[PDB]
Ligand binder design. Structure first.
Ligand code: HEM
Ligand code: HEM
Ligand SMILES: CCCCNc1ccc2c3c(cccc13)C(=O)N(CCCC)C2=O
Ligand SMILES: CCCCNc1ccc2c3c(cccc13)C(=O)N(CCCC)C2=O
Lengths: 464, 464
């Protein structure tokens, strides 16, 4: 039960001693983030641990992190940890490996250009207005509002319309078969029973693939596959969404995106942007209600750029420095990816350190973001860290809320524009105050997702 | 049960239609060799079939075969089919993959040079004499002789002494712990129940690895590991064998052969040279007893080069053209590897044919060796095919008894020198005649090893 549990003693690398079979998973009782803080404080710059039989080497050195995420990305550190039975979703860009990934990123990167993005702002902006009208009636009511649900619906509306050209008010159509399915595409909690068991029993993943058992519920994938097949066959008789952009890239080097590859990207885009965007949007409105100074300052900035509740535009969005500072400071405190990982594909020596084939090199983003050594008052919400007076003292490989290098988040600038468009229209119309249900201070789940312990609820007063 | 069973219909490639789950394995009731002849005759140049869910594309075109075994060996077609739970034997050169294999072949090729080989002939030659004295007493007795056993013991003696510097008369020491274990390293019958089940249930191989269950009986591997560890620790206090040559290459580019890598090569060498050498030596003496003309002609050639029962030498061995013709013609009829295989590592187009990632490209050596289109009277034993008058009409990619290109048999010229040294000393002293037990004509097993149906027995008369 300890065939590989000797690797870090032999390489001289420190860390918590592993138990036969389990590795260090019982140390996850407090969640990925507490585990990474404790190891960092205890073992220092570099340390190892075992997810079952799987050795994970954590690195915290900015120069080492860059070699991994940027320098030897293609040569050595190309892929993330395989994580369970995955079926045809093996070809979604976030899961594909080595040369297939590079072909998919080349094929899909033209779809996330700033040019295409500002062509999508009129679509996103429309559901900002839907978000507002939904919020006002739950404000005129005066009853506390669950951000998870108002911003979930917003994020869904922006995916349904920019991904597929489907226009739904999901908040007022929770039974549209398109909403019911897509709502099921939540992010994975790698500390829940199924994934914990998979971690101790990875030899069982090939058995689940053969039974077409899949972490993506084949009930929802099947729906979307046949949905996309329908949109693909319609339209062609008679738009600026992701699906169309992928239909078009099938008409030119690299082999055009096959029909099933295409569907796989549509799905992963949903999975990668849905519960993420809503989690950040909720964390941000949590900090704005517990720091009224900042909320007022931001409402003041928005009103100056968009006088008279003027509708936001791509260009007026990139203008708002304080809004950028607020978004960023929220992502420092709550980097919802928690860790970046890369599989070491071959024996290497980066920065004087020998990394053997097979190890999972992991960057504890949550921990580096709250390290005393780089950040004053590291638990405080303090947007002035990202003022231009201060943002140059910030290491791009310490602050990695979207990752770094060729395999960073391909939807970053889309996700930032989307969240800010939401915030502008929400703050033009409303102020957000705490309640008695409001967990102050916010507690994070001990699970495997960086999310509040209990969901966040707030007062929403109308400014008019 | 037919997720991949549609590949050859879609690519336009012909072949026998597969059954859910099984693929075409039930067609193996007649053995690998009959299956390959029937498909060749029926589907022609190229055809596909499924070993369980595993698609195998057979190719018979000499130009296509060369692209696979020679041209795109490193780029595309580097590795053989994985075949079962294999433990630490994952690093033996015949099993290792991609860049690890290339490092091992670079490290071990200097050990199979002609220079080192003629330095080993005095060792091999010694057990030729042991073979003779063993044969004479079973000849003076007059009782039929089982070649499997006389040549098994010969091959063992040559491995024990050239591999490890261990000198045993295995025929007269069947209880030496070193003989008992090494005798257990027989070749795999991929049509026996365990490997058939593995072929239908490959998703179970990771479960067997985790239980340290291994196709190499960990009872024998453990013995040799600790044996080599002993020879390694002895000697060093106080030789021209393979082990020493590997000890020496650990003292220089590529990282020297680690202690466990070294042991893995020692073992695989045994597995690759033991039952192979004895099978060919037995097939050859079968043809010499059923073609007395050829046996006399060869005895005549040997006596001319080595007058007065003179002991053979490296240089007098490469002299004997008829002996070379006999060995080669026997290997045509009985290429004991039966097939060469390479895994297609990425989508390629060789010779106008699209090969997708994952397919096992297989070369039916047995079948090409008995193809009417290249060979007159293809079932006849006719050594004059390899006379210099005729051997230029022979395609090196049709006749592939040791494979071809960078991944051919690294012990070829050793195995040829070894078999010929055996034949010379045996034919200087004895003539071999059939018996009534002698299966005429020889029938091949319907199993997965190319071997006689019933073992071969012969009269052995002394020439003096
Ligand atoms: C606030 C919202 C989001 C955050 C914080 C976020 C964060 C991240 C992080 C940390 C990574 C890992 C990159 C690495 O390993 O270095 C990632 C990858 C990725 N993200 Fe985002 N993401 C967000 C929203 C989105 C959206 C809206 C999309 C697309 C519509 C998206 C698509 C992807 C994809 C496809 C990957 C995998 C990229 C690849 O492997 O090539 N994400 N994300
Ligand atoms: C008559 C005796 C033998 C025959 C007919 C034979 C035949 C073969 C064949 C057909 C291959 C496959 C090559 C390919 O895939 O193209 C092979 C590989 C190999 N043989 Fe032999 N072999 C014999 C004896 C030996 C001996 C004596 C040794 C070493 C002592 C040996 C070591 C190997 C090894 C290590 C491989 C794998 C090479 C690699 O993957 O790099 N064989 N053999
Ligand atoms: C063989 C599969 C075992 C399944 N098990 C895990 C799968 C994936 C991950 C994983 C992680 C920890 C423990 C188990 C697994 C992990 O940190 N990450 C990085 C993202 C941070 C939240 C993973 O992608
Ligand atoms: C996933 C493992 C399934 C096990 N099963 C087989 C393993 C290996 C081979 C194999 C073959 C046929 C059918 C099953 C397997 C085969 O032809 N060769 C080439 C050598 C010719 C005798 C193999 O190395």
């Amino acid at each position: 039960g300890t065939h590989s549990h000797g690797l870090f003693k032999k390489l001289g690398i420190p860390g918590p001693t592993p138990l036969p079979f389990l590795g260090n998973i019982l140390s996850y009782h407090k969640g990925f983030c507490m585990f990474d803080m404790e190891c960092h404080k205890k073992y220092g710059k570099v340390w190892g641990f075992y997810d079952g039989q799987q050795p994970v080497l954590a690195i915290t050195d900015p120069d080492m992190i860059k070699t991994v995420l940027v320098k030897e990305c293609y040569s050595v550190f190309t892929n993330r940890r395989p994580f369970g039975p995955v079926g045809f979703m093996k070809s979604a860009i976030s899961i594909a490996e080595d040369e297939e990934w590079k072909r998919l990123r080349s094929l899909l990167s033209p779809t996330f250009t700033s040019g295409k993005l500002k062509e999508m702002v009129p679509i996103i902006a429309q559901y900002g207005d839907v978000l507002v009208r939904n919020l006002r009636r739950e404000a005129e009511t005066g009853k506390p509002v669950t951000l998870k649900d108002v911003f979930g619906a917003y994020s869904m509306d922006v995916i349904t319309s920019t991904s597929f050209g489907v226009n739904i008010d999901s908040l007022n159509n929770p039974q549209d078969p398109f909403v019911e399915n897509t709502k099921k595409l939540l992010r994975f909690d790698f500390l829940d029973p199924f994934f914990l068991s998979i971690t101790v029993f990875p030899f069982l993943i090939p058995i689940l693939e053969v039974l077409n058992i899949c972490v993506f519920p084949r009930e929802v994938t099947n729906f979307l596959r046949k949905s996309v097949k329908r949109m693909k066959e319609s339209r062609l008789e008679d738009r600026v969404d992701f699906l169309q952009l992928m239909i078009d890239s099938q008409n030119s080097s690299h082999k055009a995106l096959s029909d099933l590859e295409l569907v796989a990207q549509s799905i992963i885009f949903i999975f990668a942007g849905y519960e993420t965007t809503s989690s950040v949007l909720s964390f941000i409105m949590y900090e704005l209600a517990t720091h009224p100074d900042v909320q007022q300052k931001l409402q003041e900035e928005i009103d100056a750029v968009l006088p008279n509740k003027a509708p936001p535009t791509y260009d007026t969005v990139l203008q708002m420095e304080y809004l950028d500072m607020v978004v960023n400071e929220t992502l420092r405190l709550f980097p919802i990816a928690m860790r970046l990982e890369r599989v070491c594909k071959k024996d290497v020596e980066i920065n004087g350190m020998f990394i053997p084939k097979g190890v999972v090199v992991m960057i504890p983003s949550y921990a580096l973001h709250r390290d005393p050594k780089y950040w004053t008052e590291p638990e405080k919400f303090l947007p002035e860290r990202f003022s231009k007076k201060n943002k140059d003292n910030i290491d791009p490989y310490i602050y990695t809320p979207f990752g770094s290098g060729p395999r960073n988040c391909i939807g970053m600038r889309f996700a930032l524009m989307n969240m800010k468009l939401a915030l502008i229209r929400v703050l033009q119309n409303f102020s957000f105050k705490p309640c008695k249900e409001t967990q102050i201070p916010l507690k994070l789940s001990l699970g495997g997702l960086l999310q509040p312990e209990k969901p966040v609820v707030l007062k929403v007063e109308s400014r008019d």
